[PDB]
């Protein structure tokens, strides 16, 4: 159908640097008028969206000309010259006409050195045993870049039910990103097996990180 | 100013429906279209709708037929939406803004969002345990366990506050209407066990204030 196909999904830069997000319409986006109907918006943390440009080149009231967009047909684009501290944020482009329609979104983050993840794997406490729950938690903390995949083993077998995972936004300080996983059992099922396994899959490494423990060692 | 000033807050039980409003000041509300975009958590903006307060007419995203019902009140430029048969999915901020065309052909004006929360669960205070090192380096990373409250938010600090950098607090994840979270804090190895770490988890809703001191697992 007429979607609206907004890539890249995430688009790190060093501030100063260029960043251009792109937007494609499955069909050709008609004309309202001469004027083609194709806005782009940007949504800072805890705020409600705020237009940058319409019409596809035309800069809003107060925005700078840093931001300018362009495109024809089913492409468009919005460029940002010198990103600056305060232009981060998610960009979202939008269809006006016909359908009105969304992009999916460009987060528009900070680029660095890549960094492997420190893990730190926990078991559950006496306290949460005394109650009879069992979390195992791990951590995977200041990595970058974002992308990373957690795989949780009990007795070197793969568990995937009953694990939740939860990850920050970049850090405002070293720009890193950091990760929460905790696999959830009963004190049953968690006191009928030994080893207890947290593993990180980072492209900063070609053989996995592995954090463990095994219950009975104290 | 044009301003749209939107219903505060609202928490639901599945199946009942809500009503949110967008009171609209500063402009001639009988001669612009009206809009309602949805965000759930995390994810990107939705077009839900729009109606023209002029004669009523409307136009729905084919996906919120039958869930979003847009009505507008001319006396007191105010506009509303009513989602039925609400469910999880529900869950979600929701904007309302004016598409203006003229000098300018787009959203250029959002309210400030009414955040509507779908839920069965019933005030829950928070279980806290202690994140600490199993086994006896130079950097050592320490946490706490927030889990099972209802509902957001819980305030997460460590040593009152006073302890800030190297902390990670994760947003909290919903299983099973309930909400889990963990916090991490990585310090010099000669501060800990030797000088005190202890995270205090407040949980306003609950009226409930919870402090753990880590301690070596001996």
């Known amino acids: 159908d007429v979607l609206m196909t907004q890539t890249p999904l995430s688009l790190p830069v060093s501030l100063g640097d260029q960043a251009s997000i792109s937007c494609r319409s499955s069909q050709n986006i008609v004309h309202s008028x001469g004027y083609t109907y194709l806005e782009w918006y940007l949504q800072k943390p805890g705020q409600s969206p705020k237009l940058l440009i319409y019409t596809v080149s035309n800069r809003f009231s107060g925005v700078p000309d840093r931001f300018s967009g362009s495109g024809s047909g089913t492409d468009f684009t919005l460029k940002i010259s010198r990103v600056e501290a305060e232009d981060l944020g998610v960009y979202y482009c939008f269809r006006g006409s016909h359908v009105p329609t969304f992009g999916g979104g460009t987060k528009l983050e900070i680029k660095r050195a890549d960094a492997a993840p420190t893990v730190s794997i926990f078991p559950p406490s006496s306290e949460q045993l005394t109650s009879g729950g069992a979390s195992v938690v791990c951590f995977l903390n200041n990595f970058y870049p974002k992308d990373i995949n957690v795989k949780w083993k009990i007795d070197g077998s793969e568990r995937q039910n009953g694990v939740l995972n939860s990850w920050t936004d970049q850090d405002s300080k070293d720009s890193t990103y950091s990760m929460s996983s905790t696999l ?25 990180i592995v954090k463990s423990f095994n219950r009975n060692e104290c | 100013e044009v301003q749209l000033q939107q219903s505060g807050t609202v928490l639901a039980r599945p199946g009942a429906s809500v009503k949110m409003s967008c009171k609209a000041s500063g402009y001639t509300f009988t001669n612009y279209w009206m809009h309602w975009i949805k965000q759930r958590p995390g994810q990107g903006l939705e077009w839900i709708g729009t109606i023209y307060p002029g004669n009523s007419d409307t136009t729905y995203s084919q996906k919120f037929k039958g869930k979003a019902k847009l009505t507008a009140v001319t006396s007191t430029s105010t506009a509303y939406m009513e989602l039925s048969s609400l469910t999880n999915e529900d869950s979600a901020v929701y904007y309302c803004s004016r598409r203006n065309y003229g000098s300018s052909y787009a959203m250029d004006y959002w ?35 927030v889990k099972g409250y209802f509902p957001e938010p819980v305030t997460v600090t460590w040593n009152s506050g006073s302890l800030s950098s190297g902390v990670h607090t994760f947003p909290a994840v919903l299983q099973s209407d309930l909400y889990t979270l963990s916090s991490s804090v990585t310090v010099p ?30």
Request: proline share 9%; net charge positive.
């Open chain 1, 184 to 208: 959830t059992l009963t004190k049953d099922e968690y006191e009928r097996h030994n080893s207890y396994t947290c593993e990180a899959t980072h492209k900063t490494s070609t053989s996995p």
């Open chain 2, 111 to 145: 309210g400030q969002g009414t955040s509507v929360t779908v839920s069965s669960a019933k005030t829950t205070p928070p279980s806290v345990y202690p994140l600490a090192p199993g086994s006896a380096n130079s950097m050592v990373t320490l946490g706490c366990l």
């Open chain 2, 189 to 218: 190895s000669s501060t800990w066990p030797s000088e005190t770490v202890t995270c205090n988890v407040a949980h306003p809703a609950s009226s409930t204030k919870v402090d753990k001191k880590i301690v070596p697992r001996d």
